Amino acid sequence: IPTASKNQIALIRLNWALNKTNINTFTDYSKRNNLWTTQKLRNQSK
Amino acid sequence: LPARATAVVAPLPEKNYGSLRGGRWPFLYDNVYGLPVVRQVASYGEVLEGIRTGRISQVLWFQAPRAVTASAAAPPPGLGGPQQPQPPPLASPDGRCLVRFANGQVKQAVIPPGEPRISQALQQYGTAVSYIPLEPRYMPELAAMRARGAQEAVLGEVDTGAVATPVELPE
């Protein structure tokens, strides 16, 4: 296979990784994070 | 040592068996290989009745090599990977097959691989269905050997005539 094909296959593998890190579904505004984080973090000193 | 005869021969009249059209070839043996040509052609109904009545002992289909890109047992070869072994050969799409009768006679037939009535008869009546493996000159594994034997020398007047393809012990 050509070097351009090998580079494209490598980029597809690089995109396949970082999805296998399982960080893609994390959102700082999820209701799950607002259940723990923004519930202990909101009471605060006040 | 073999014969080197040369004579004028009148070719046989062109036949028409319906299933296989021509066939003149006034020689008993073909060129290239030198094996007896199967001059007899068995029709579809005759093959079916021979399977039903047990007069046909074997059906042998010829094979055709299968394309590497037609193999689903691996990722496609366009993707970078190991070269992978050759896929198993297909049955011949032209349907050419040999029919071995119980009396030793061998006939020719054109039976499509996948025909319902013939396949049903071959399933019920237990006639041996075989596949002729491939030719060495048509095997993709020996394509490199065929190419090297065609594009290189055979003896280079080095020793004498007694071995077969001595690229290990050169000529």
From Swiss-Prot, chain A:
Q: Which domain of life is it from?
A: Eukaryota
* Compartments (UniProt record): Plastid, Chloroplast
Protein name per the record:
Uncharacterized 341.7 kDa protein in psbD-psbC intergenic region
- Which organism's genome codes for this protein? Chlamydomonas reinhardtii (Chlamydomonas smithii)
Q: What is the lineage of its organism?
A: Eukaryota, Viridiplantae, Chlorophyta, core chlorophytes, Chlorophyceae
